[model samples]
Target chain A: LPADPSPELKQYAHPERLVTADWLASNLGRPGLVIVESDEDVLLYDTGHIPGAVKIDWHTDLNDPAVRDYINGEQFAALMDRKGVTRDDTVVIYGDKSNWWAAYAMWVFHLFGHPDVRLLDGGRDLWVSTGRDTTLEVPTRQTSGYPVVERNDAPIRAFKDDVLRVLGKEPLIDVRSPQEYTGERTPEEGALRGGHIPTAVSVPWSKAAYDDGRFRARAELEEIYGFVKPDDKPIVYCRIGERSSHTWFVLTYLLGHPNVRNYDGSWTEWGNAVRVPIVVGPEPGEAP
Target chain B: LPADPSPELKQYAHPERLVTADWLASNLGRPGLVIVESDEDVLLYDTGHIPGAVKIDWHTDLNDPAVRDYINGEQFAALMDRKGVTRDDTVVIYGDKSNWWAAYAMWVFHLFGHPDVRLLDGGRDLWVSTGRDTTLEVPTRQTSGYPVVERNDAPIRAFKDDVLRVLGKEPLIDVRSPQEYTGEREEGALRGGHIPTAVSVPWSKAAYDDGRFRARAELEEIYGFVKPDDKPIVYCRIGERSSHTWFVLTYLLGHPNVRNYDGSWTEWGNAVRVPIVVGPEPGEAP
Candidate 1:
């Protein structure tokens, strides 16, 4: 048996979707593998990053500055071209903030139907803390003419209108701090109102991960997500949806829940929108 | 007939609470008068201010830095002493931003039971726009032993709990932008939406583009919904804008029981278990 097999990762529904730091250490510079580091702090990758990993800024690289939505298919193709990512390449993403933005990047990739996308377990902090090799030297690779694929949002993403339609019909999870869910505090992005969507259950995204930025064991994850049934199609959300993307990863990959969707608009859009029903306090309020 | 008689001022309920640029110009350097320039921009005074006018920063001089509340009575007395204002002196305040912070300072003075407080008609921009003299000279005056009076909040100021109690009992005025009132946009990062039972009345409606307040008749027509005997409450994001409306209601329209909910949306919108309403219509009580 390998010394660090990451045995706990086997219990996940899609074990292949997550790669251990040791596994990545052995697989560095391998052909057909692209390592992307997406982060909340865009400049963090420049200071020091994993060997052969290219940087992807969650803001500038992924988002459209003029609109609230993400970049188009053409823009995504351009990003892949700029990053030297090819269609058949297996992209493994990692980042700071417990892979919050990394997971968001993965979700965005899924929108364009990328075939093989995986996350580095515990992300960048895990690699750095475990005495892995990091480099300031930028890697030079041949750019690929990645074809523009139509972005399909229906399978995995939820909008404000979708959320409104599924009010009490679906299981909506609020993956933000309890303070935010209870209307006691508002995020820095701001909203016209505080509180969670009516009938949404409060399950903070932090509960899915350990302090060292690693996902918890499968048993603990099941206990934390006991409310989610096998066939249940749950929608997850956070302040601006990055943290919810983390939960989206947990539900879709770890818990093996089918048809999990991330509401990217989340609280900033929902709370600012006119006439949406909101609920305060600890309980999952009764839907209107 | 008196020269520069300000016929428009006479129509207000408490016309004595306001003084025109002409009135202030003629009364410059009067013994019992102290002109205060309270502004959103602290450095505006250094650029130039009304002659003999002292600067009062709304953030530093008035607000308590450690807490959300305003400065204590002892601090208020120290402020008055530093500004060379005595208990008997009449304080005529003005500032930029259409006297938003100016009205806030006046409200704080009212809390401390300052007997004689007035607003300069049209504030700082009006003074400059009307070709009035503005001096860069910082006045040097003897500090007075101004007595510390108990800060009273009952009559004019309203808290979150007070607002909750009067939810359906009294009229609530949301003196913010229409976007804020309709929950389309928020003034700050707190919560969106208005307090339940609040009527949308943007505070800027009370003042003209030239910076002077609308005439009393126009103001009356604007605030026609508020009855004379109704004890109405007004609020905005952090209570500054509402203070301007409070000044309009109390001094201009002469509503006896008008109160400024100083905590306002920052408190109510963020607080748990409070009823909130979204959209253009004022929501009914639960």
Candidate 2:
């Protein structure tokens, strides 16, 4: 196990590490690389795109308020067929718009039992930044049949008490931003004042990448997460676990740390706890 | 606009068409440049990120389904303060986790009234593709105040009626897969069937680069919706997929014509009187 990067980080750091943008890019175009692009253009794709990129949009995929988790399997299979993806394909996905959308897709892929799945480091932004060359104009493609990967059930997660035992004691980071963790409501404006758990720390989910939506290096990642050591058990969360799962992906996949878990409850659950310790504002404090 | 590379690419073809990775990298660490990274264990930020990156986590910044569609000003102010971001900050964000997260952040930044906020073309994936230097070290940070950007009510959304008006006359794509779009029973799903007159065009929010996600421009070219001169309006089952598409078209493709039918497939597919398609309905294979 690697040494703890930050002593204070353990005050907040989750156990697992994250993969860097470099690692993800290096894995590009690998065999079994099943690429899922959400909210893609039909008219445009009729023209062309990256080889083996399967398209699925989150809003369309998760249009339901109920399905906070993912698109159903049969639904996913059909999507795979449309995108010409197969079960054996190594999957890498991106939600062209919101990073969490793709994170959601990545999470969904994991749920379905697909192996070697990952989120495109920068997503379409990286592709866009690279060049004007596109798959849109390529020769027409034939939709491929995709075999479903049995979900390991390992990816579908929860906030077990065993993990929570450490929130106040061992280490757990509320990956949700200060606002959501505190139930402060988003600019989009939803609920407020649910407040965060007493023992949680604020990590907000985006620090793994740059503001333009790029991932940072492992060196920098190690620096920011100077608290927990690799293989230390750590818990992470944000609203619905999507963003936190993004962090989960970062910690375990990018940084190579182990013992990480996403507190799927995030602020939504902790905030809803009847007697749970809740904190407001950026500071970690007890419920007022 | 420059001529397109392929004749079939009539829609996406044209120079002055897209932004590139090189262009952005050259501008890195500029006066107001701010970067945001998204990862799990590396939550929040260390002392600082990049020369000027403002580390943001999705759990921390983007989306408040709870809030309806707004971010907190104080939190925004604090975020900016932490990274020295200001109203004038030229902000860029990237995350490998979900494009929605970063794009949502960018969208929220704009909605919050911040000016000059853009997503990294390829995000961190592309940055590393460059094999640039990285540091585990944190930087001493500068703090700045942020004046939230007022939401752009008009251009940012569309309603079910908006879909009705555009029905076959305008191109509408369901960003979901063929099954979900065609009304197959899904987990926790409500209604079955797809929107009438809308094509089941499963779009990925991210464009493919090798296998990793790439810069937005490179991603948008794959979408083909964003021609240098045109941005087609897009819609998904709900506004979510289309919003992802909207970000790709508007920001990455640099297509100014992009618009999101916020109601997307959710409203149109489930609502009666809206065109509907049922049972494994498949669009013409690409």
Candidate 3:
């Protein structure tokens, strides 16, 4: 759980929602604790990882076989069973690109009602930076009987139509690069548009984490997302869902924003859709 | 010019040979200091580079337009003029991918018989790692009339026949990964397997984590295959990584008889007349 290293996080809604590498190191082999590694760079987990960490590649493992959406409840339950993780075990997820995808995994875990889930603070880079031990050993686990629960996507995930309904009415967080937000550069191929949705705020996901690749202090997180009221129920999006999910984690759990959702369709859906309104440049001529 | 940073480098015949980032920084705008960035990653130069650095993209700028080989003497002379580099000026080459292509540039400069040239010890990575500044300012210089000199390929380069001549007589160094050498993995656009009788000594073993060359003792330990009398020929998939070893053996360790098989595996693997060997063990006596 958020390793209660600093006393300030003690006041958050879920202070025990993040754990340090040290906590995981000492309690690695203890029963009912399963470590998972999810990353943007899929090759990294194969090179070396926190000894017992199982890999869950965001692109392959999380995505559905033939659909644009994530795996259904049955798939998620079967995956947990395959990984030897039961409903009761605490899953500590961590990864590269500043734990952007790891936070996405935690968000998905929330979708399936996996009650006991936490993030590893700072993730793989911090572990490497701190000189913690890593191994290439891929552990084999015994299958479990974790049941497939119905997904509650309404609370955490937002489809494109839902996003279109609340454009200016709610705070829409565009958690992409400054260039992407300003329509300066079109990154992906075959995209119909470069600009963001009308009235969306440009808050690149990288701002959520400090230079050391850890989530910033509570005060700073509050300051960054301060423009929106808790009752407004902000929706965050990026090139894909991974980054916004990181911001969603900070907003929902760390800052205790009761109602925030990640628009998983993000730019790929919005920028490429027909008849969708796209606005270039910053909010109200706030510079490129 | 080599910046004379370490006193230990003094014993080598080519002392004052490797320049540091500090040396390049202070001497950035000097009259005779020509900074050149050559790389496999063509986009890196446009992104951000050491101020006043001219780019010679290995794929385009350095290579001949119509062929696979490097540009001829006349083309090289035009390039030097275009970059405003006189024969007497000290050229400092640096780049990314652990300076693999930078070493390739340095070796090519040597081919042209340039009087003075050196590598930016650890290349762009070291400069960035040390928090040294980089800019997008592309310098334009006065074109010089540096003479077109014939390149000397014999002393430092090896061909397929040259490899055949010394099959049993000398130790041939295959500067590729163990997998590439052992026929476990094939990585090039063409055929696989290493040259006959080439010892597997991966080129990566010569560099350290800081992206700089390892000490002489370590270099000797890894490259101990270099006998006192034999002229060792080192090779990799292409010429780039092998050129790094060429720089190390020729300059850092000061071994006199070291030549890079520039055509390397690509040439050796593709040539139908030339035989290829595959096995974990190196080739035996003819």
Candidate 4:
């Protein structure tokens, strides 16, 4: 995506990757454009969503129904077809909780190696507060014969083995609550264990977003995530990976960091893994 | 305060006991009117509260500084005077969580035999969502010569002894979550399960979105198991949530004989010699 020359948001790399509410409002129902809403609270969209927007539930729709693996290319292609999104269509994603899961959906799209995706800067709360209209009417779309896009999980997605191999080499970002990072509690979807991957730094995803539920400026983001050297490969993870996917988007696109991967298996895999090395406490320290 | 001749609210015993956001907004600066806010979240008032509102935290402000018992008559009078509330002034209480703690505060005030006390319908969420104004400015008040209102602790507040004596004779309403009721999880105060034979009627069901109570008829249907003469006991992990139900049974339904087990499940679940019942897990019958 090309950066806009507008004085505001001019500093963010690929500024056009983030669209404004007004921009989405004007572009509604445009040819080759599909708006998708993905959220942590899957029921929020049922209350009221942006008119003509299709909902992609992060828990159910994005992941395979029976397995932990993300839906294969055929499933994704079928999904896109069902949503009336063509291969050439520009898919604009947005949702609640400061676009935490929306950015995650974007990362998943990038995992499939699909191009032409954008995010609504501030999520539903922002849109509503900005005096925008919402509708309960669920949209019916004519299916598009979208071709199967081969899923490429190598570059963007990381497995537990990748995490183990890259240990002490790549910078791992633990984007969870302080309690979770400190081995005090296993939060989010009721985790079985506490503690984090060894050597992973605690950088909560909340620092990247403002209290108003919008992403912080690039300079501010730099201040929070500046520890990573430009050449360093960064891995972001949370309890499951939805929150980390938001961080993945920030590191990869917003700050223009190259070779950033999302460990989607995240702490659910790492925390529960037997005989795996783990670190506890606020500081970067060895496990007791 | 007189009840507005609204079609729906007329059935309630004291319909005017609930003041609307519009009513509070219009009557903000009137003399002899005290607006008190009591919330589960203590910091909510610090963020922003209604203009001229006073906050009474459930844990810190309302309870005795050094003991589990609520403050005595002298302390309660001092509190009222400190907040510029005279004995005859119309004190209206409102708060968050559908005024759960507000209802608790009202019940405590009832122990002191305070007259002309009412609740703000829908509480803080409704006040904000109704496009009403709030301020960060904490108001100062002139100290009144408020008299000591002795805490009766007779009909309203129930202790552990009262709990032991009333068992099987009185209807016990357990207002804690189902997990807490089933002993699946200990939510607060290091306690699990519930008092023996207390019925599970979660307090959250009493509140709806926008911080308002459900219809009086619906509330009646849910709590129909309670009898006025039975002197039923209501409780949560702590007393705050149970007070919400106590308000429903006492004020809305006009039940006379209701006692809040103030020590509640916190005292019961943690203390020895109190029998507890654990519910069966999924697919297993109690």
How does each model score on TM-score?
0.57, 0.41, 0.49, 0.50
lDDT of 4 at B112: 84
- Residue A160, model 1, lDDT: 68
What is the DockQ for all candidates, taken in turn?
0.07, 0.01, 0.01, 0.01
lDDT of 2: 0.53
Q: By descending lDDT, how would the candidates be arranged?
A: 1, 3, 4, 2
* Best model per DockQ: 1
**Per-residue C-alpha lDDT of model 3 across residues B25-143, encoded as one tens digit per residue:** 77888888888998888888899999888988776677643224667899899888988899889888889978999999888888899988888878888888889888988887867
Docking class of 3: incorrect
Could you tally the backbone clashes for each prediction?
4, 155, 7, 0
Candidate lDDT values, in order: 0.82, 0.53, 0.77, 0.76
On the 0 to 100 scale, the lDDT of residue A205 in model 3 is: 82
Off by over 4 Å in 3: A1-8, A187-190, A284-288, B1-286
True contacts kept of each: 0.09, 0.00, 0.00, 0.00
Q: How does the DockQ of candidate 3 come out?
A: 0.01
Off by over 4 Å in 1: A1-7, B1-210, B213-286
**lDDT tens digits by residue: candidate 3, A262-284:** 88767765554433466777662
**Deviation (Å) of B160 in candidate 3:** 61
Residue pairs with colliding backbones in model 4 are none
